[PDB]
Amino acid sequence: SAGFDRHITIFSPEGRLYQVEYAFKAINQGGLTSVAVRGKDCAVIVTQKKVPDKLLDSSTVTHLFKITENIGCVMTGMTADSRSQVQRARYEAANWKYKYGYEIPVDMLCKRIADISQVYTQNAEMRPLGCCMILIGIDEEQGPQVYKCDPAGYYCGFKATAAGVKQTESTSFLEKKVKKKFDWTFEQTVETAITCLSTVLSIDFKPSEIEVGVVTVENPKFRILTEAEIDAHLVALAE
Amino acid sequence: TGYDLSASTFSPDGRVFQVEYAMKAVENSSTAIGIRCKDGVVFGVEKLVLSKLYEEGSNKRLFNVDRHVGMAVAGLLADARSLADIAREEASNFRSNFGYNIPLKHLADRVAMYVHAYTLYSAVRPFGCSFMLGSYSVNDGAQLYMIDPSGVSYGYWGCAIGKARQAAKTEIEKLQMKEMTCRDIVKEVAKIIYIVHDEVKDKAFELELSWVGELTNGRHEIVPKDIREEAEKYAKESLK
Amino acid sequence: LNQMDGFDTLHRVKMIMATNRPDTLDPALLRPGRLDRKIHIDLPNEQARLDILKIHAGPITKHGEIDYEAIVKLSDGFNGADLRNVCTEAGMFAIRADHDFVVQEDFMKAVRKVADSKK
Amino acid sequence: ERGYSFSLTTFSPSGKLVQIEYALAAVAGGAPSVGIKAANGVVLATEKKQKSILYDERSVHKVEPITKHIGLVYSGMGPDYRVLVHRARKLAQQYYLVYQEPIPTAQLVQRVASVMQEYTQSGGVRPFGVSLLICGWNEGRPYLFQSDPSGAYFAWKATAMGKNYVNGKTFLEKRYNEDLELEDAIHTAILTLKESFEGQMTEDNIEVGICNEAGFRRLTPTEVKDYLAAIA
Amino acid sequence: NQYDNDVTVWSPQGRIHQIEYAMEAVKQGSATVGLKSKTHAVLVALKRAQSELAAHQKKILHVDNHIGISIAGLTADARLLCNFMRQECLDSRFVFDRPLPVSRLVSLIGSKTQIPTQRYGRRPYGVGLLIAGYDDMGPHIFQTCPSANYFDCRAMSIGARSQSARTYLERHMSEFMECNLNELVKHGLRALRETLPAEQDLTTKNVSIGIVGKDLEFTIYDDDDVSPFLEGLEERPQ
Amino acid sequence: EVDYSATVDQRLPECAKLAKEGRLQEVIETLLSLEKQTRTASDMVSTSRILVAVVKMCYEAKEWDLLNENIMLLSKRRSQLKQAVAKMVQQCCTYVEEITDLPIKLRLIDTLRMVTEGKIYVEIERARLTKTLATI
């Protein structure tokens, strides 16, 4: 099923852009997974921080970035491209606020980020960015919001999404979760993200093996739960 | 094959082969190591004098990106010098744009983005030199960053770039770099490097060091000649 | 496809066609009586490294105790085929050294040999 | 034609620009949208079915407005829809600032299609693989145009792109009377989709817009639910 | 294989085959021997003649009053690089009103040379240069192979059948520092006369010597001018 | 890994004396306080000794409500060690047939069953507890 492929601008005979297709298969080359769960008034993103060395400066091995004071993003996929996508976003929001007088809603920031990725799929100049972004933000008039922008430029509004090597089970796990409708309390949402990531991998999730981000309607600011809190949260999940 | 000729083409398994090849050409360079002391970072690079006719200290791999930052390119040199010049133009534009020394992290991020900027277009090839940045600042501690060809840049307490990467961490992993002041680290970085570089292969060699920290007062300048002499003696005594 | 759901004889033989890439496989091939069950076998299970080493390590005489746990993290993402070599390659290290494996120091380097030299 | 399939600027020996055709394959394999022009207005429909309950159905809307009197429905690569709409609203806008009257639906498609044709004249730019249905009510006569990745804009009365399009057209030509009214038209439009949407027509699974005398508007989930309940 | 047509493709073994080939350009031209003493920078070039009655090719170019170079490679490229240096030095003299140091020139030559090795649209400069100049930090002898890498050399010998010239110099490198003007050049001519085939011996027409010293600008000795340095040259054993 | 051989050898006797009085509380709470110290240290033995110790003390003390609660609370602990958790189970089922009161026994079997449910290390003990549940 290789197709004409070797060029992103040449359609396969069936109408499938193979080069764009291969983008997603590059997405899981990062070997990690991030899950975002939207609660009643919060959205929690949990990622895998597998630091394969005692020499690595653990402070800078983070997959979580702060796009803006109210919107936080996690990258799943190639670290280099994910970094560029993060950096391109920050300008896109800052241009949004500077241009219209207010902070860019998390809705568009994936749209503009998606729109940038889409033109790289038509004009055979830039090789596509091989990383999916998840934007979480407390949006006024629409509660907490989560979005996942893919290499081909498709973004959607997700009650919960996960991108990474174990996406099929992560989404199946969440799909099992969201349906038995429950009061998604901030504690419930943070717990839900941890369980989702834990069940798929089958890991204990030592305190430092993940990086959970949290955004709540009460304090609409992007925060990364400090290692003490995840342990407290993790112990809460156990009991 | 088929997907390995252009940097902008994704293999059906989903990876840019060109980047992989360049990162696997850095494996064919001289070993370069970096250890960050409690108040600084130390860089010690093995330089293989390819023939008795290049004057001492030629085609050096220890560069000064800016006043306080350090580079220790490991890989194809000619690509390194290019990466050095871009870094300085990035720093120089910084200091003139923001009035203060560009923080190591931001210099690595901008320099990392430039490196990743060349692994996206078919008209260019990815850089073949992966380099370690080192600096020390009373307001920012000591920071060490390794920018591999692919664009990833995250800091290392102690890292090695070149043929002996795995061999270089192993003997670096057995040191408590968190504490010893790189007064005593230089004797350790030099001692490490001699453990690597099996003599039977690669024949003769030379060793260049540099440090950033309080000891330098915030600069990166090469370790004073006097200090190196004992350091090399200190490493030499460890033959057994 | 024909020789499976095919006139001739349906048969009593079974096929275990195993792939490395499941997205590529065509839809008809994954059907009830035409090859079903997409059993996933990811890199050796976290606990398996022990069991695999347990099933592949014990054979080789080795009185010395084992810190298997470190070997487990010393061997992350190991193909399992590598793990088989790990113990066997360690035996070559032992084949040099002396004749009895009495140290995990062996698996450590053996783990390296079955990693950097297995790259 | 075997080796000439790839480049969009090299005629095949039979005079066939294949690449445009393959792009039209991407349209013919997309979300079904249906359009019906009732003598009282224009009704458009498309199935917004997500791949799991994890999605927020109200996030991305397919049936969309351009101005107050024009809307679009697409069957093809989504993200390639958005780049089309923006050059559509801008083009619809650039008409307003210059002539100060709402852009006639004929012109918009003439220039929303001419946007498409721009990308199919050079190598290095893929054709817009999303057929578009454009509804409008201008000069007191409902309008329903289809602009294609090939750059040709039609004047459809009632059609349907996307999966199972051949069957959808056959349902039309059957239950399409040129003399309906917008109220009946919505029922017919929903039914045409019903011939392919594999599932119950949940109010967050089908998105319908009505291009009437007053203007186009993406039907709220309820009103469709009022409509869907009646049909079922 | 198939990865050896463009400099912009990485070979499986991690090499950029085009640069390796450009490297091969240097060996094509007639060898030049470059050696500096503590007091002078003298580089000897073995000129070639196209035909019996054609004047012999110029191998030593004039880069500046304090920087001269030897070209061993393409004729067109060597000219293009020589033009660049002169323009670079001319601005350096005009801007800073100071002799631009050889180290700074060599660094800039590499930077201009490295762009071709990374961006499709041009070919690697098939010109290997022995940059000889006298700045305020003593005489220097740099060499820039087409791979955009320049090594600070005590003495180097590039060009056709060069490895002989190198092997003589490495054998006599230690003595090079404490050299008088004539002794240093008589070494270098001895180096070039190693590269020459047994039949050929260094004649007044095929050897050009360029010497830059403490109080001396880059003087290009050719034809009769070479004789004063040539005169007193020791006969090759045979 | 940290190991608490002596400590579990020392803390246990003092707790056992106090628990017999009827105070319990402090004795049980302090033991589990070290359990977080042990569990997090990879000390299956001491936890096995500690986990066994807590169950045994209550069983001798005849505190039924604390026993039903404790096996539930101790069992579902964060990353509790397998063999130690198992060691608590056979000791409980060895206490199982010792328990005679039906409502007390039925609660005991149910608690032991659930903690063991879907647990590979404790299936067989689960089978007998189920069987004793059937025969009950």
Domains recognised in chain E with CATH numbers: 1-234 (3.60.20.10)
Rounded to whole angstroms, the Cα distance separating A102 from A93 reads 10
The closest alpha carbon to B147, from B26, B14, B4, belongs to B26
Taking contacts as CB-CB distances below 8 angstroms, the residues of chain E near B119 are none
CB atoms within 10 A of CB A191: 19
Q: How does DSSP assign B143-154, residue by residue?
A: EEEEE-TTS-EE
What letter represents residue E84's amino acid?
A: F
What residue numbers bound the domain in which B110 lies?
Answer: 1-238
* Residue D179, burial from CB neighbour count under 10 angstroms (0-12, 13-18, 19+): exposed
Residues 6+ apart with CB under 8 A from B135: B41, B68, B69, B70, B104, B142, B143, B212, B220
Write phi, then psi, for E63 (nearest 5 degrees). Answer: -90, -40
Gap from E121 CA to chain B (nearest CA, Å) = 8
Rounded to whole angstroms, the Cα distance separating F66 from B94 reads 67
Angular region, A185: left φ>0, alpha ψ -120 to 50, beta rest:
beta
DSSP, collapsed to helix, strand or coil, labels residue A234 as helix
DSSP, collapsed to helix, strand or coil, labels residue B225 as helix
- B120 — contact with chain E (CB < 8 Å)? no
Contact A14, D24 (CB under 8 A): no
Q: What is the CA radius of gyration of chain F?
A: 14
The closest alpha carbon to E236, from E195, E187, E194, E188, belongs to E194
What residue numbers bound the domain in which D97 lies?
Answer: 2-231
What letter represents residue F71's amino acid?
A: I
Place of tokens 């650039």: D94
H/E run at residue B60: none
CATH of the domain at B39: 3.60.20.10
Polymer length in residues for chain F: 136
The closest alpha carbon to A135, from A90, A195, A167, belongs to A90
Contact A216, A186 (CB under 8 A): yes
Rounded to whole angstroms, the Cα distance separating C76 from C115 reads 10
Tokens of D97: 């600032």
Rounded to whole angstroms, the Cα distance separating A111 from B19 reads 29
* Residue A11, burial from CB neighbour count under 10 angstroms (0-12, 13-18, 19+): buried
Give the method used: cryo-EM
DSSP-assigned beta bridge partners for residue E135: E138
The closest alpha carbon to F28, from F2, F66, F1, F65, belongs to F66
Q: How far is CA D98 from CA D95, D102, D103, D134, in A?
A: 5, 10, 10, 22
Q: Inspect the interface and report whether the beta carbons of D25 and A153 lie closer than 8 Å.
A: no
The closest alpha carbon to B123, from E115, A119, E110, belongs to E115
Q: Inspect the interface and report whether the beta carbons of A238 and F77 lie closer than 8 Å.
A: yes
Contact B125, B78 (CB under 8 A): no
How many domains would you assign to chain D? 1
| Residues followed by a gap in chain E, C→N > 2.5 Å | none
How many domains would you assign to chain B? 1
Rounded to whole angstroms, the Cα distance separating D102 from F91 reads 84
Rounded to whole angstroms, the Cα distance separating A133 from A85 reads 8
Rounded to whole angstroms, the Cα distance separating D132 from D119 reads 16
Restricting to A residues 128-167, those with a Cβ less than 8 Å away from any Cβ of C are none
CATH of the domain at D144: 3.60.20.10
Angular region, B16: left φ>0, alpha ψ -120 to 50, beta rest:
beta
Provide the CB-side half-sphere exposure for D142 (13 A, CA): 29
Across the interface, of D26, D29, D126, the residue whose CB is closest to A9 is D126
Across the interface, of A9, A115, A125, the residue whose CB is closest to D83 is A115
CB atoms within 10 A of CB C69: 12
Give the pairing type, strands A210-216 and A42-48: antiparallel
Contact B18, B140 (CB under 8 A): no
Contact A36, A45 (CB under 8 A): yes
Restricting to C residues 80-119, those with a Cβ less than 8 Å away from any Cβ of A are none
* Residue F16, burial from CB neighbour count under 10 angstroms (0-12, 13-18, 19+): middle
Write phi, then psi, for E46 (nearest 5 degrees). Answer: -95, 90
CATH of the domain at A135: 3.60.20.10
Taking contacts as CB-CB distances below 8 angstroms, the residues of chain B near A125 are 121
Resolution to 1 decimal, in Å?
3.5
What letter represents residue B25's amino acid?
A: A
Rounded to whole angstroms, the Cα distance separating A166 from F101 reads 49
Residues 6+ apart with CB under 8 A from F76: A238, A239, F115
SS3 readout for chain F: CCCCHHHHHHHHHHHHHHHHHCCCCHHHHHHHHHHHHHHCCCCHHHHHHHHHHHHHHHHHHCCHHHHHHHHHHHHCCCCCCHHHHHHHHHHHHHHHCCCCCHHHHHHHHHHHHHHHCCCHHHHHHHHHHHHHHHHC
DSSP-assigned beta bridge partners for residue E151: E143
Q: What does the buried/exposed string (b/e) look like for F22-46 if buried means 16 or more CB atoms within 10 Å of the residue's CB?
A: eebeebbeebbebbebbbeeebbbb
Contact E201, E236 (CB under 8 A): yes
- A204 — contact with chain F (CB < 8 Å)? yes
CB atoms within 10 A of CB A133: 28
How many domains would you assign to chain A? 1
Rounded to whole angstroms, the Cα distance separating B240 from D58 reads 72
Quote the strand ranges of chain D, DSSP E: 33-38, 41-47, 64-65, 70-76, 130-138, 141-147, 158-161, 206-211, 216-218
Gap from D126 CA to chain A (nearest CA, Å) = 5
Angular region, A49: left φ>0, alpha ψ -120 to 50, beta rest:
beta
Q: In whole angstroms, what separates CA E156 from the centre of its chain?
A: 8
Rounded to whole angstroms, the Cα distance separating C92 from C79 reads 20
H/E run at residue B203: none
Contact A8, A20 (CB under 8 A): yes
Q: How does DSSP assign chain E, residue by residue?
A: --S-S-TTS--TTS--HHHHHHHHHHHHSBPEEEEE-SSEEEEEEE--BSSTTSPBPP-EEEEETTEEEEEEE-HHHHHHHHHHHHHHHHHHHHHHSSPPPHHHHHHHHHHHHHGGGTBSSS----EEEEEEEEETTEEEEEEEETTTEEEEBSEEEESBTTHHHHHHHHHT-GGGSS--HHHHHHHHHHHHHHHS-SS----TTTEEEEEEESS---EEE-GGGHHHHHTTPPPPP-
